[PDB]
Amino acid sequence: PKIHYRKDYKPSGFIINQVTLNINIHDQETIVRSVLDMDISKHNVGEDLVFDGVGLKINEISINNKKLVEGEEYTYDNEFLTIFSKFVPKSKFAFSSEVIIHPETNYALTGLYKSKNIIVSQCEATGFRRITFFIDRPDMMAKYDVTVTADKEKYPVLLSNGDKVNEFEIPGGRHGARFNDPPLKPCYLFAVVAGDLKHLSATYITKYTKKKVELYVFSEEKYVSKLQWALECLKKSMAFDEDYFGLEYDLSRLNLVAVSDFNVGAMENKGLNIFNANSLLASKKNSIDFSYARILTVVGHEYFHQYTGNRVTLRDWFQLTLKEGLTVHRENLFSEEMTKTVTTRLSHVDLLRSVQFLEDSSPLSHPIRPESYVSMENFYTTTVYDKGSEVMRMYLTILGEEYYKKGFDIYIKKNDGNTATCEDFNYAMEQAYKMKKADNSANLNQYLLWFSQSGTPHVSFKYNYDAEKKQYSIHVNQYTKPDENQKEKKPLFIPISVGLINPENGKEMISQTTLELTKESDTFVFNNIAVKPIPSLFRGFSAPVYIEDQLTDEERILLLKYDSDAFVRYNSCTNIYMKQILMNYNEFLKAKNEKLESFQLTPVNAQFIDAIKYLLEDPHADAGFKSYIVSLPQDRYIINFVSNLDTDVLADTKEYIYKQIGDKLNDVYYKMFKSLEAKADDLTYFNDESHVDFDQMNMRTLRNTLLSLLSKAQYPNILNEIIEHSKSPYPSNWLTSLSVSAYFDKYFELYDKTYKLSKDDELLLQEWLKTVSRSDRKDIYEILKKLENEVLKDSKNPNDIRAVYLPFTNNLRRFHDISGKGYKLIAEVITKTDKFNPMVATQLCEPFKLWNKLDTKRQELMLNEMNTMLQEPQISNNLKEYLLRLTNK
Ligand SMILES: O=C(CNc1ccccc1)N[C@@H](C(=O)NO)c1ccc(-c2cc(F)c(F)c(F)c2)cc1
Ligand SMILES: [Mg+2]
Ligand SMILES: [Mg+2]
Numbered sequence: 001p002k003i004h005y006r007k008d009y010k011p012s013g014f015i016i017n018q019v020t021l022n023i024n025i026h027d028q029e030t031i032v033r034s035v036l037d038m039d040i041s042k043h044n045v046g047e048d049l050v051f052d053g054v055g056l057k058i059n060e061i062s063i064n065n066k067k068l069v070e071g072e073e074y075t076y077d078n079e080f081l082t083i084f085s086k087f088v089p090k091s092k093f094a095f096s097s098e099v100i101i102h103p104e105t106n107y108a109l110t111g112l113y114k115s116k117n118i119i120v121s122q123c124e125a126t127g128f129r130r131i132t133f134f135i136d137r138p139d140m141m142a143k144y145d146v147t148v149t150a151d152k153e154k155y156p157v158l159l160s161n162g163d164k165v166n167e168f169e170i171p172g173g174r175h176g177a178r179f180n181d182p183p184l185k186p187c188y189l190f191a192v193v194a195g196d197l198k199h200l201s202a203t204y205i206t207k208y209t210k211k212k213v214e215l216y217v218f219s220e221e222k223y224v225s226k227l228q229w230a231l232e233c234l235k236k237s238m239a240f241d242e243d244y245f246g247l248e249y250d251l252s253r254l255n256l257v258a259v260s261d262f263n264v265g266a267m268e269n270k271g272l273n274i275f276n277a278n279s280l281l282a283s284k285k286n287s288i289d290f291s292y293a294r295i296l297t298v299v300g301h302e303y304f305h306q307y308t309g310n311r312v313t314l315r316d317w318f319q320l321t322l323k324e325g326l327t328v329h330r331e332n333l334f335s336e337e338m339t340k341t342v343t344t345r346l347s348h349v350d351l352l353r354s355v356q357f358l359e360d361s362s363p364l365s366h367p368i369r370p371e372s373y374v375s376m377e378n379f380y381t382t383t384v385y386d387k388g389s390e391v392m393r394m395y396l397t398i399l400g401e402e403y404y405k406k407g408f409d410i411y412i413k414k415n416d417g418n419t420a421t422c423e424d425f426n427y428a429m430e431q432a433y434k435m436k437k438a439d440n441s442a443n444l445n446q447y448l449l450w451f452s453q454s455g456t457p458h459v460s461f462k463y464n465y466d467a468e469k470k471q472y473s474i475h476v477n478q479y480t481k482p483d484e485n486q487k488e489k490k491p492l493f494i495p496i497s498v499g500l501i502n503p504e505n506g507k508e509m510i511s512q513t514t515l516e517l518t519k520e521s522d523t524f525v526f527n528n529i530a531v532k533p534i535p536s537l538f539r540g541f542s543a544p545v546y547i548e549d550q551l552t553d554e555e556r557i558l559l560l561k562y563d564s565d566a567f568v569r570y571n572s573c574t575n576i577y578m579k580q581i582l583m584n585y586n587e588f589l590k591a592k593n594e595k596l597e598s599f600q601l602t603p604v605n606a607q608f609i610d611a612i613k614y615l616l617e618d619p620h621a622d623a624g625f626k627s628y629i630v631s632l633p634q635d636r637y638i639i640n641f642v643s644n645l646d647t648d649v650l651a652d653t654k655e656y657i658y659k660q661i662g663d664k665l666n667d668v669y670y671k672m673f674k675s676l677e678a679k680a681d682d683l684t685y686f687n688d689e690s691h692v693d694f695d696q697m698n699m700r701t702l703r704n705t706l707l708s709l710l711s712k713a714q715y716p717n718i719l720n721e722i723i724e725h726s727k728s729p730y731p732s733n734w735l736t737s738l739s740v741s742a743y744f745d746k747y748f749e750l751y752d753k754t755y756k757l758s759k760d761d762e763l764l765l766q767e768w769l770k771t772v773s774r775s776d777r778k779d780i781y782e783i784l785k786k787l788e789n790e791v792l793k794d795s796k797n798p799n800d801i802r803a804v805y806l807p808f809t810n811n812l813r814r815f816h817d818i819s820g821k822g823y824k825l826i827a828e829v830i831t832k833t834d835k836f837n838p839m840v841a842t843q844l845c846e847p848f849k850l851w852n853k854l855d856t857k858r859q860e861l862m863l864n865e866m867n868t869m870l871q872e873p874q875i876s877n878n879l880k881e882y883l884l885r886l887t888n889k
């Protein structure tokens, strides 16, 4: 079990200058011939030449056209090809090889594989070595000349990186295409695609050089009608990079390709971006609303990599957050600008503070630049991506837009065409910082701790107001809990975007202000503050921290109603809910523990309920924001605040709070559900795939949230509304009708109706599976067995498996059944999946990430299943390493 250490980075003793590939796809095998034009680097010390090569069948290998002989001159152990140094030339030489691989049976979806009838590659991070021999690491930059051949009837469309420079016929019904890609690239950005693909295309003219760029979007023929939105999103992405960052695409063509079988969302292979079909394809008749934001963000994300990852690439994999954190940040800026809805930023914060905060307080906790790894497939985490994105966003908060753009351009201009490290980016930001502060003594050395220190900081506040002096003080403290990565945690550079709200009229009392907290504690004083303010803290969620605002619920209500910042309003609401949840949770827990025959629960604050009503009834307030305020915080957010969390007690706590609020507001909810119908379900543009209205989609979100609240409440005759909702043309609506009908005897009638609506579109059927999996059904285990027998079967498609099982694992009452039967079920699925796709097997482990935060009985139950999976003799490297880390072995 080889551990790679960040501090051990050393350049290779070799250079690979040119790659010339011939990939010949046949019925039962694929033959890969490769010539590498190589050289000896200045770091060489006479070592053996060792290539990565995993699962390759060697036909021959040669150096300078002399066939090498196994045993005497090289050894191969299915992982490394070692050429003994006595046979390695001392000057420029050619290494060639012919190997056989088998994409048809490559169900792990790394390297070269078959997805339905498409041959497709996935090489990030270390998958190129499953295609041919290489020094498979991103600092080995080379030129590529790639020829693909295949049966012409089965595979008429051939694609790789670069320019297609030849197309030719081959005897026996075959054909070939040659692709030359002269710019240097790392091998993880290599890609090849072969299939019977159909496309949409357009021409984009760049903003400054006025270059014509051909844009192509590809899918299997059945789904070509679902490509239109992706093409629009690509045009939008190109314009945003031009408009915000001044960056234009440099190549003549950009291809996007959807495949059905994909481990993640999409991949930024140079000029040949490859997508999970669920993140590229949509139509209004066959997709839920969520698909439209997903395609926009994933198309944008892969496009933004062309600069932040492709043109400026990574020195080594420890720098992953340099391209992923920065590209997620660029993707989020883009998405916020395109949607023009406050819920876009709120949705990102919601994900961070539930999923990523849980990870950062789990045994898996790591900084955004870890110190070591064993599995590279396990290295791709919400910490590296989403905390990384918040760390890259804090630079923008600190610098402001003008100086951020200046620093970002310094980064691009200095590193374009080269590998880079996190320090290179911090250095570029620091030059901007010196400019903004007007002294070359300023530095961002402390900022680097955001890359090395794991765990979530806690920031807490105390206040003081002197009415006679008109002087206001904010006392701030920061603290990070020690963990396995640092025994002593250092103070970070924390930017705190702040406003001060006048509680009498709701107005801003100071200009835009970002406090720079760089010590364990500091006191920030404001003069000429005419009345005691309510502070608006961490506007926009300006640092990835636990905020302890120390405000009363009365103060939080005033911010919720009258503050200018969407996040602080949403967070104030969140904090009111959390105070209520923790109180009622403890009251329910004590009654359970003490076996009480009677007890009292503290009711929900009536003025809070009044404020929710006030906002809901405001016709000028945002429908998406409204949907957030009527929803309790996510379970995975709540769990960060409770030790030994009893999931039944939490389910009872949530049920009480929702019933308390609904008992007061259900008539408001119903009136709104009806009044929103006309605008929410407007069909004017239903047959225009280019017309996407994020505000309208947010009104549907609000309607479907309200319908869920009313159905759980058994609001009088709400089943009539449910049935009518099932007839809506919009899948978001008619799939909602299935889930909310769970509380009625019509559930299985709607189950069958929506199945019939879904079964003939692959992606819609997966959305149907998720809806079933998520259904609040007491017979959910029996239902899951029915899905297994009738729909899922032995599919190896990750989208199918994830759709059936992951939503169910969020069922607080049923997945965490005290028998442990839910833990048993998902562990059986993980073990079964691990036989053919270890990466996806580790994704299915997600519900176990909180195991040591549950009550002691459920801890034991989860740990038992995890130890059972660890005892499987055939466990993958991925799954073993993951579960060993997660269980603190
Ligand atoms: O789709 C997404 C969504 N985010 C996300 C996914 C997973 C974890 C954390 C964040 N993220 C992609 C990206 O960043 N695209 O730009 C991405 C992610 C992973 C690999 C990859 C694939 C493999 F098959 C591997 F074996 C491997 F090691 C890595 C490729 C692309
Ligand atoms: Mg093999
Ligand atoms: Mg323009």
Ligand SMILES: [Mg+2]
Residues within 6 Å of the ligand: 297, 298, 331
């Ligand atoms: Mg995203």
Ligand SMILES: [Mg+2]
Residues within 6 Å of the ligand: 260, 762, 797
């Ligand atoms: Mg299928």
Ligand SMILES: [Mg+2]
Residues within 6 Å of the ligand: 363, 484, 885, 887, 888, 889
């Ligand atoms: Mg540990």
Ligand SMILES: [Zn+2]
Residues within 6 Å of the ligand: 268, 301, 305, 323, 324, 327
């Ligand atoms: Zn990415």
